[PDB]
Symmetry: C3
Subunit: 225 residues, 3 copies
């Protein structure tokens, strides 16, 4: 394909594909009912990401949205990805910090709102409004990141100073990470146009592989803890 971004989408499809295969094989020999849940989650995330990245690469997950006086290329497929993978990623984190059912419901609902309002902002035909939908979506994220920071910090403490002060390098990687997405959307082609589309695609691809594959490894791992 010609579109400059094909390479980052092709690289994302390759990587997510490799990660889901690695997690499918790693998940063989697991019979513990809770190692099974964590493996179900950790494997499904990159599997969904793989399909959505391929849809963007093959051109299906792409659409044109008029605003600011132009026909802007908007990859709606990402939101379909994030719509299922983010709930699943918080699910893993919540099972981790042995959070209660009500908390899982708040995080997930707030996460649906966050992705749902991002897609509306991503598809709004009136320029200025996109940013209103960007703020509401980021407000829903501060909420999420809030509940998480005190989900990890509340658990980080109940463990030794070598393992307590560690479930901290998970809480921490997970929050800086997520915070990248709003800034990538805002300076990107959906948000402002400060950064070109092929760089924005690169930024999101480096972020997506980090949070689904990279972190998944880190997450799965540090069980004992």
């Amino acid at each position: 394909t010609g579109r400059p971004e094909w390479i980052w989408l092709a690289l994302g499809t390759a990587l997510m594909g490799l990660g889901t295969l690695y997690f499918l094989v790693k998940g063989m020999g697991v019979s513990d009912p809770d190692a099974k849940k964590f493996y179900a989650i950790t494997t499904l995330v990159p599997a969904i990401a793989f399909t959505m990245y391929l849809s963007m690469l093959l051109g299906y997950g792409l659409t044109m949205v008029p605003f600011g006086g132009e026909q802007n290329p908007i990859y709606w497929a990402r939101y379909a990805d994030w719509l299922f993978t983010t709930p699943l990623l918080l699910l893993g984190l919540a099972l981790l910090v042995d959070a209660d059912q009500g908390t899982i419901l708040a995080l997930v609902g707030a996460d649906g709102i966050m992705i749902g309002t991002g897609l509306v902002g991503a598809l709004t035909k009136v320029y200025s409004y996109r940013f209103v939908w960007w703020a509401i979506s980021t407000a829903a994220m501060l909420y999420i990141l809030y509940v998480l920071f005190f989900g990890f910090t509340s658990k980080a403490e109940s463990m030794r100073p070598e393992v307590a002060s560690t479930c901290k390098v998970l809480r921490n990687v997970t929050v800086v990470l997520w915070s990248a997405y709003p800034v990538v959307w805002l300076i990107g082609s959906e948000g402002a146009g400060i950064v070109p589309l092929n760089i924005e695609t690169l930024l999101f691809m480096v972020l997506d592989v980090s949070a689904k594959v990279g972190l998944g490894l880190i997450l799965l791992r540090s069980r004992a803890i």
Copy 2:
């Protein structure tokens, strides 16, 4: 905006927004695992309603549907709202009447069908058929309201005559309420055209704030009971 309904959509966005804020603050100081679930639910409902009302106000949640020989303005956004808020509202009621898992599954599935068939009826391009999809949707509602009436009435009894004969003014408000929606859709602009679009918008806005904010307060409250 000019569209006559902007005022009811603006009023709905303001109110839902105020209610979700009130529920976010009220929900601070809750550590009981089950008060947490009820607060998650009660707060999320108006939060989703707020976003969908804003989408209709900003013009995104609106679409044109041809039928009867005209380009009719249909707010598809309402169905996206109801799609998540109604399941969540029955969830609160079911946790209340300590209903079993199977019952929750029947109510929720039947509720998805009810909203799903309302959207199809709302989007059908053949006039007469809209009413077929209206009947199927209302049949799915009688089912819901049925299971609920005997969920509350079954619990209403197990309590004293002062508190039994009360979880009755909840069962009761909840059924009259929901029953309004079909009649508003039928006489409205989606259904018949007996009532104009701006009045229909007013009718739905008075109903939506009553069931998410108004009732939410009433629901949250009457816990002891």
Copy 3:
């Protein structure tokens, strides 16, 4: 209606409708919390199928998709059906083989992917790619059928040789059945065009009534077992 397939869609709407009514009545007199779940599931499946079949019959669930140099009639509604009914059908099977939560999550997630990629393949405007999305979807199915075969075979054993060697004629009917769908899609009008649209509609209608109504009866039944 004229479209040759109306008869199979009309027959599907009639049958699914009859099956859901039969399951609604049969489900009266059930108070056991787990017979309630199985009845919720078994009844909802054909209820959703009924609505989606009617949408296809009334012409709403149909859409035109260009590929191979033609305007091909694609019933998108089937995927909306399968999107909710397949998860629900595996739910019944999983509760049956007393599978754990993690397994249910793997099966369901993989099932969402399977239906999601079938819809993308069904809606792809580039001919060759449809088959790529067909393979990925069938890969997600082998996974499902895999986990199931060892869900039933693992349970098939724990029972006598008369009842063990039986939960085998369920495991078995369920796998041959599902395997039909990919071959019907591939030789059908969405996939290759070897079989005409009205025969493809017939093939899917004979399969859908078998797995929702026919099997539902078989499933519900063989409880003791």
